[PDB]
Design a protein around this nucleic acid. Structure first.
Lengths: 258, 193, 125
RNA sequence: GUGGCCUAUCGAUCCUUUAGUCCCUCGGAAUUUGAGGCUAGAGGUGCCAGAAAAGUUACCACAGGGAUAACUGGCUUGUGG
RNA sequence: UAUCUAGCGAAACCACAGCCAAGGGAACGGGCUUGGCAGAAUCAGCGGGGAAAGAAGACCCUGUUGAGCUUGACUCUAGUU
RNA sequence: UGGAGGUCAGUGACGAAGCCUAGACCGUAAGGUCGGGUCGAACGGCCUCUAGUGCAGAUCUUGGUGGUAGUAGCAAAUAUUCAAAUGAGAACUUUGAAGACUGAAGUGGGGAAAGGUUCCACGUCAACAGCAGUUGGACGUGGGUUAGUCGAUCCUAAGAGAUGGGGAAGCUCCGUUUCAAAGGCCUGAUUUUAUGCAGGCCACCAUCGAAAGGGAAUCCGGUUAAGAUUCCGGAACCUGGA
RNA sequence: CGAAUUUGGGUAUAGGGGCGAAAGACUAAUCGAACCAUCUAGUAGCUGGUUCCUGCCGAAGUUUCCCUCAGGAUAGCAGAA
RNA sequence: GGACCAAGGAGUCUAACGUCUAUGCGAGUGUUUGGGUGUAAAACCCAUACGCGUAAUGAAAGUGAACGUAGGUUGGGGCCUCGCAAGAGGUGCACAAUCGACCGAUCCUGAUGUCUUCGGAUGGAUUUGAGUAAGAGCAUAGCUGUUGGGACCCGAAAGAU
RNA sequence: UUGACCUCAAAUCAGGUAGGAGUACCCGCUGAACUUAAGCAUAUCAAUAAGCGGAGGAAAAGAAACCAACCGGGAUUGCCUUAGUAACGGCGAGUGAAGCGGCAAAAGCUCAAAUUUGAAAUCUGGUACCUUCGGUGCCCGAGUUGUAAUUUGGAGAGGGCAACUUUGGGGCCGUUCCUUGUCUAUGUUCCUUGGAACAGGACGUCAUAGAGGGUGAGAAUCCCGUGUGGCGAGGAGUGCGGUUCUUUGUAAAGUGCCUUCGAAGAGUCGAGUUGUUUGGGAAUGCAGCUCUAAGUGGGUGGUAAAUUCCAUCUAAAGCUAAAUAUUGGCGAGAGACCGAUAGCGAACAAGUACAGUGAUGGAAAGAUGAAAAGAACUUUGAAAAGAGAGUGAAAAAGUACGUGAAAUUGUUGAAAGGGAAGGGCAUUUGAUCAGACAUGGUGUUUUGUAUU
């Protein structure tokens, strides 16, 4: 708050053939007689100095947060969204990828890597490993020296060495079904995170988020309803129930007359 | 200045408010420090429930008259009816409040019952024993919760006798308003023969 | 990744600690790895380098150059090895520094303290 | 016939003061006084949509103004010639 | 002294620049219009012009900008009674 | 444009970023892409986030640089000249010779304030001496200041200022002998016993304040590159001590 | 130009104060109220500046009130949704 | 104003808000003061409260929103019934105009009763309200606009300590 | 002729203590104006800045002379809220709390006023002894104008019954924080580029370690570390389990019945007035002056004045952790921050150099290279230096050093030029330069003979 103001500068006024900016008084320095206090001035205070009471955190409604989390989880099961997000799942039989609780009980990093290789997430591992690069700016000397891709998110229900076994494996993240962060479920606000569920995590999803026959255990919460019954608007448009009332069409393009 | 159709706002920022700005950046760190302090005090008093047993009291005003909440400490009358001295209650973890009186039998019974429950549910170690610890719990408040007394049943019988409960309110307000004038009239009529 | 809160992964702090380390810490910083033969003999992966250790270069323009250490210039963060020099144009031979991390220790200068440190780190002579 | 034959002859907030219900409040119930409210007038701002207000500076200062005076120049030519 | 030479060597100023006549134009042009014209590089003088330079006119007005001084201005005050 | 989250398993020491280029293409443009030189360690496309985000001006700020311009100028204080030496080099250094000047309220010989080593010796062009420089109060390295008698120190002047006291919320203010219980030199004591004691006089009424006021006392000759009323030789004086 | 003389050193007087044989003079090149730091990035209806491109739309200097006349509110004119 | 060139250089952030828009939920809404937990400022999870909204009006004591298919009339998109292309009928949400009804305030007339001075039924009135009349809000974010803040950047003469 | 008391002195008497610093936060005093009101005087700014006094790790406040008006809460302090509200305000500009409610933290209390009077039972100091933050002999002193025990308003005070917990004290192994120390994994294997491999490729290894840094370029595996555990060079020791010498064998605490009571703070409450202050309004707090109390008294109950009744506390004496604050100090971890005209004034011998008599003012200034390998030697010059040579990956890195941009210059080259230059349209001239002619189709006299 005192940067640029540790000076006793006063304006010289008019009549001295110099600008009316405040000037440092005294002599025999070279700093004396120099402009001060202003944003245009060298050593002066910046314009509108940054303050700490700027709004840093942003409030989001609990329901909107849970809506986004549910959308991200549902995007994890869309095969095309995961490809678009770029997760090297072209050699996985099907997604959502559900594995046994032996993975929950896994202990060593080498055997966690073996599990990933046997299941099909090793290509994502190699992508993370080979994408490591130096940052492209002044972020290197701000403790952000390297950047790499995001690997699979291993979601478990119980922690029996799963976290520590995957802790050193690069790019892999591990999460509990109870938390299931949106910052890990849609990094960069991009849907379709590659997720490896344990069987217990997959089973507990229905308790955590509710169903048509089960409540969410998030009190007062139920999953959002789509605004449209199906996304297959092409199928609806081309259904017989509509085409029957539809009047006959043109040529998909008009012949140039005159 | 003043301008188009807008509310008149009173933003009290004509002093040097920028010196007195307290933005709570330490919310997370202070929550961590509070949890750490609670854990450290629990380790210090390792067998003890981390807090004192508070009584049930009524909230004072007419707006919170309905609610029943946790007070500061039990009355000397309450701890006497439970069967303890004030000093021993304080020493074995019962909050004692000297200045609070009980003009209310219902609250008296509720707090005496709370005291009996606490006495039954705690164990006092001897001063020269083997200290048979019992997996300390951390909240006397959580294990002796304050429950709102049930005032009435869900269903009852309609007992109508024809006063409408609005004429009653109007009349009671009228008697309150005019009692002094009525007493005036009575005293004047007694005085003037 | 780090887990403890007294470990700092800040580049500025780590660099300052390195460059302003005293000589006692520079001794540990200037540790050198033993050869394969010496590692098999002792059971020690690396040791803080000393003045009379016989050392072999395994990296740089003097790869495969043998020589006994002539000094451990902790101020310059380097070691000076005999017969690893540069002949200036005037004919004077000047020492050429090199980091002990680019060396391999091929013969240890053993005294009571070196042997005790070997047993401490897990060696058996 | 709801003042003057018509077209002028006049006055906010705040405060005071009067008139009216003797109507509401003084917040722990009130004899009662006092005070505060409700509605209509009056006490006044003539700079009349309403600040509470003496000069001097040739010792002077600042922000400005060619929105504005003291030269020239420009239009005019009453006046002068 | 200026002047020429050896050495040494600044500054004020500078939109771009540098020939006129008239016209019109912010009513006195180096530029624009129409004419006159118009030949490298320059030296010493000079004081007509550059409405030359020096200074956000000190005169004048405006500002709900001051300050020094005065008083039967408004509002107070130290002392004193 | 700087940063941030994702992604291109993007570009790169076989050359990133920057910079130069009357070379090319694209876009109406903001601008983007590439060719060729320079180089040396990081950088970019895309979807989003974010802001200390874009300059021709503000008599803008800070640096740098021009034309003016090899121009104004380097003209007060009478004035310099010949030879030799040294030197790479001499109008300016040194030494001779001449001509002069200050002309004893000096351009002489000392000091006060101030400066602080400029004093003195030894080495040459980088800077400085508004020309030059072999010279210098410059640069580098060294040496140099000797007191009983000269000063300070002591005294008091105008004055400043503690204490005792009294103000003031207080920092502090007044006051300087005031409404105060305000201290110091000789023999007896000076050894079975100390500075304890009828041993005496008593009553300056802090202190600071002058290198020109007052005041105890040193002169001559010689000596150094540079100190001398200080060193040496000779000859004296003052103060304090049985 | 022998004194109301000139001057060294010491000392006193400090800012709404001092000091003045009196000029608003002098008080460290500062005086019709010194200098230093801070309040203070004081306020300014006033002057100056206000940084990329293209596309579409596109004014007002008028009304009423204002210590109002270099300013504002209001209505109008304009854009966007 | 600008001799020149480089770099720097001027509508910012915050508190409280207006219109609009997007989103979530919706007669409700807002987790984040706190508590639990955590892969140690992130997640993630947890309300009795509190804010705003769901009732107005009056200075206040206080009183407090269906005479009806939540009314009548005009106009209304859409939908329904329609003959071979007119155009007729019906129902008509939103919204606009109008006449009413209800709640509060003001001015009135005052019934059975009676702490004979109280309660105020009933009927009204060119009066009046930011009201009712099958809720629309709460929260977050964004542009723009507002006010207080250095407040787009530079600029006094002054004033204080 | 003597011995005391009271008060007041003296001593280089014995032993202590205070001052000053720092001051971010804390407790007070004192105290403005700029500013806003579009002027301005009350107001605002602001009970702020400057000035002064005084502490600590926090300070302060704190166990009601409280809030309330309720079915009543119950020390203090903070947060959310109350609430931009009630109120204050030329009722203008503006200002503006508190109760309740949720939560964080929670903790309680002790003096005066009582005769121990069958025993001043209390305490500093001097001198001895010892287990020395002290404990015991003795002596003097203080003290009755009152030092101990006893009671503090919640209460508490010359006694007696019917079963009735405890004790308490200096040590030792150890629960517990650090100066902290030490030990604990895995390639430097082959090829390419390079001066250097830390870069590309192949093969691997460890991983509860792929954080970060160093090393001649982007290094988990070369080094330090990092992750997980293990073992230790010391200090602080009722939030305690067992030992340790043992209970100073009349040691201090409650009701089913009260023989009496029940001391409770004075120039102080309170009233007036004055000034200041508060949202506090016929006056919120504070202070000066005047008057000046009382015991079912006194205060309050947010509009000034007898009361049939209330309600609620108990002042004028005192201590007390935690939640709370913290632009200072010490230690540590971070950042969508800045990146050498930026960020602190200061990345550097920076509060330095220099400017002022002084108070004060206060810069500029980072980068050779991996390594000085900082250029031996030869030649010209008086010398600086040049030209060769040399080191280097590079000297287009030579200390005036990473690339070195623009303004501004020198040289060469090319062009125009009769009192500006520059610009637009259009062409011409000279320079310079990009755009199918290997091809989704036909086919052939072999260029050097999956076809050319």
């Amino acid at each position: 708050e005192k940067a640029g103001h540790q000076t006793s500068a006063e304006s010289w006024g008019t009549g001295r053939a110099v600008a009316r900016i405040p000037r440092v008084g005294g002599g025999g320095t070279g700093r004396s007689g120099q402009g001060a206090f202003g944003n245009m001035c060298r050593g002066g205070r910046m314009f509108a100095p940054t303050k700490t009471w700027r709004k840093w955190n942003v409030k989001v409604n609990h329901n909107e947060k849970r809506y986004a989390t549910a959308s991200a989880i549902a995007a994890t099961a869309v095969a095309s969204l995961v490809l678009a997000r770029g997760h090297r799942v072209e050699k996985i039989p099907e997604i959502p990828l559900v594995v046994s609780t032996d993975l929950e009980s896994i202990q060593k990093t080498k055997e966690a890597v073996a599990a990933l290789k046997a299941v099909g997430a090793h290509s994502d591992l190699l992508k993370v490993l080979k994408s490591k690069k130096l940052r492209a700016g002044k972020g290197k000397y701000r403790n952000r020296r390297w950047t790499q891709r995001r690997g699979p998110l291993v979601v478990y229900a119980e922690d029996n060495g799963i976290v520590k076994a995957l802790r050193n494996v690069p790019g892999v993240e591990t999460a509990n079904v109870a938390s299931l962060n949106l910052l890990q479920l849609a990094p960069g606000a991009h849907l379709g995170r590659f997720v490896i569920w344990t069987e217990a995590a997959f089973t507990k999803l229905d308790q955590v988020w509710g169903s048509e026959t089960v409540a969410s255990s998030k009190v007062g919460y139920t999953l959002p309803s789509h605004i449209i019954s199906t996304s297959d608007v092409t199928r609806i448009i081309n259904s017989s129930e509509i085409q029957s009332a539809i009047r006959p069409a043109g040529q998909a393009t008009q012949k140039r007359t005159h | 200045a003043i301008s188009k159709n807008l509310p008149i706002l009173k933003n009290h920022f004509r002093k040097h408010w920028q010196e007195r700005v307290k933005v709570h950046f330490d919310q997370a760190g202070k929550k961590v420090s509070r949890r750490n302090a609670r854990a450290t005090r629990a380790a210090k008093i390792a067998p003890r429930p981390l807090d004192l047993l508070r009584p049930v009291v009524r909230a004072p005003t007419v707006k919170y008259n309905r609610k029943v909440r946790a007070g500061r400490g039990f009355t000397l009358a309450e701890v006497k009816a439970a069967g303890l001295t004030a000093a021993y209650a304080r020493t074995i973890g019962i909050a004692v409040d000297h200045r609070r009186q009980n003009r209310n039998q219902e609250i008296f019974d509720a707090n005496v019952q709370r005291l009996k429950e606490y006495q039954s549910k705690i164990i006092v170690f001897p001063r020269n024993g083997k200290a048979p610890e019992a997996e300390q719990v951390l909240s006397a408040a959580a294990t002796f919760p304050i429950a709102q007394p049930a005032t009435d049943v869900e269903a009852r019988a309609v007992q109508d006798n024809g006063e409408s409960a609005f004429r009653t309110l109007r009349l009671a307000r009228s008697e309150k308003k005019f009692r002094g004038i009525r007493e005036k009239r009575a005293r004047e009529k007694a005085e003037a023969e | 990744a780090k887990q403890s809160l007294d470990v700092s992964s800040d580049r500025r702090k780590a660099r300052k600690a390195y460059f302003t380390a005293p000589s006692s810490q520079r001794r540990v910083l200037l540790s050198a790895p033993l050869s394969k033969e010496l590692r098999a003999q002792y059971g020690i992966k690396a040791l803080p380098i000393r003045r009379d250790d016989e050392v072999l270069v395994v990296r740089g323009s003097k790869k495969g150059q043998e020589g006994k250490i002539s000094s451990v210039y902790r101020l310059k963060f380097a070691v000076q090895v005999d017969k690893v020099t540069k002949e200036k144009v005037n004919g004077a031979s000047v020492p050429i520094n090199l980091h002990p991390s680019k060396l391999v220790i091929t013969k240890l200068h053993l005294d009571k303290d070196r042997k005790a440190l070997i047993q401490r780190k897990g060696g058996k002579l």
